[PDB]
């Protein structure tokens, strides 16, 4: 009956293949699903939830609480960066672990605008203005307020509304960027400077710390799944 012909690619198993296969337990009455609070329909949903960036990764402060507290002081106004960061929501050790940056390793191409949210964690009295800035790639990274200022910045203010968010608009030469430290698909440069200085009244803690959070925006998306370098199975 019916003359058929086995085609190049027969008897071939393909891990990510999708073909119907005989059922081991025929008839097994499956248990009805309840309505568990908190479903998730797509990974990029998780990508839109802020996760604190471990900004400091100094041999001493790494792998320990001190790693997320970016300390600011009441030092006389300077023009040097109080944090840097290579926009590589996958590559840069600073982002490589945050939910966003942790999901980004299970992929080969990320895209869309990101949103860094900074929380001033210090004495209700302390005030000041911090300039959070981004400058697309291909130019000397910014090391002075004078140079960073020229790029895309949001001159934030430490007040009642305790937090800010500088959206990093998706400005890139390709439709997606390599989720590996590739030179052609470079990310850009993020960097917060003091626009004034954190001024405090007498009898106040002179060294308050800021915590940074990061997340994707309803634009972001990833593609071509892979195995995260993050966890190894020794032997």
């Amino acid at each position: 009956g019916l003359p058929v012909m086995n085609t190049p690619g027969s008897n071939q198993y393909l891990t990510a293949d999708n073909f119907q296969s005989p059922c081991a337990l025929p008839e097994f009455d499956v248990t009805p699903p309840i309505d568990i609070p908190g479903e998730v329909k797509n990974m990029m949903e998780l990508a839109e939830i802020d996760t604190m960036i471990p900004f400091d990764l100094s041999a001493t402060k790494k792998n320990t609480m001190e790693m997320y507290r970016v300390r600011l002081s009441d030092k006389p106004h300077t023009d040097d960066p109080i944090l840097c960061l290579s926009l590589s929501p996958a590559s840069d050790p600073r982002l490589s672990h945050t939910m966003l940056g942790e999901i980004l390793n299970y992929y080969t191409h990320w895209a869309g605008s990101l949103k860094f949210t900074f929380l001033f964690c210090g004495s209700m009295m302390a005030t000041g203005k911090l300039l959070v800035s981004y400058a697309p790639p291909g130019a000397d990274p910014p090391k002075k307020r004078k140079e960073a200022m020229l790029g895309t910045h949001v001159i934030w203010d430490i007040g009642l509304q305790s937090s800010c968010t500088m959206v990093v608009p998706w400005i890139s030469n390709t439709t997606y960027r390599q989720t590996i430290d590739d030179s052609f698909t470079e990310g850009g440069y993020i960097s917060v400077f003091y626009q004034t200085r954190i001024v405090v009244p007498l009898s106040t803690p002179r060294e308050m710390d800021i915590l940074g959070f990061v997340s994707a925006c309803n634009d972001f998306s990833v593609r071509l799944l892979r195995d995260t370098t993050h966890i190894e199975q020794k032997a």
């Binding site: 027969s10 008897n11 198993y13 891990t15 296969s21 005989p22 059922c23 081991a24 337990l25 309840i34 568990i36 908190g38 479903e39 998730v40 797509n42 990974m43 990029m44 998780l46 990508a47 839109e48 939830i49 802020d50 900004f55 990764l57 790494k62 960066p81 109080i82 944090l83 840097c84 050790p93 490589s96 672990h97 939910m99 895209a111 949103k115 949210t117 895309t152 934030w156 203010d157 305790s162 937090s163 800010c164 968010t165 500088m166 959206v167 608009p169 440069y189 959070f213 925006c217 309803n218 634009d219 998306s221 990833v222 593609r223 799944l225 195995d227 995260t228 993050h230 966890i231 199975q233």
Partner: protein
Amino acid sequence: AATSRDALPNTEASGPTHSKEIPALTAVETGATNPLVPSDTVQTRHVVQHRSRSESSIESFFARGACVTIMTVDNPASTTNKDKLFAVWKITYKDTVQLRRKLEFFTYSRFDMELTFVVTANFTETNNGHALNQVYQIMYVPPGAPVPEKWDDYTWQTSSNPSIFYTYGTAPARISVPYVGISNAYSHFYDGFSKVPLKDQSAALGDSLYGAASLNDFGILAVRVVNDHNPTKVTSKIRVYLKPKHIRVWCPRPPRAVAYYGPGVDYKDGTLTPLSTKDLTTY
């Protein structure tokens, strides 16, 4: 209606401003994250966004079939002084790091396990011998059923035990399994004990390990070499690949940070250090 293969909300245009509207300013205490669109902190053009999340969907994340375990079994000569090797693996994904971290992002899960078997085989000893194409039996022994004693015993009669007879060298065997959970989602993380200790009893009589639920949730796989003791001893390995098909996940838990240790979330010292070095002021 909003499926996974749509197309992200197209970027709307936007000029200067000076409004008392304050999009940029948040306040993380509320726990809510400002849904600020690029269109807010800068003047954006009108981009007609084609990209879609069609690949990151919960279904596609787990679209590839991961290797849950390897199983060594071997058919030795009749004259072998040792008993014939038939491996027996207890169904439980928790044996290899890979699929175990993916599942672990979520607190609960309801999936249809679709088990495939890539069986291989070589002649152990230096001896130059031959062997007629072996056939393997992969018997599913349901939680509580009798686990096989000798290689060739009655347990293998399999009158009611879903089993597969794979002939060596052929399209790798595959059997789909529906949600065989006692509950309404396999709990990737069980907080609490399987037996509460009670004062009117000995510290032993009523104790138990933390995190352990059912003695045999998923089940056990008995795999023999079906043929008889052949002069040329041939060892084989049956790599089982589990691919969760019709799947659902609940409560997005943060991914495993330090190397896995045992069936329980517990963690060995040393491996305790995960991050890398970087100067707080160097790009």
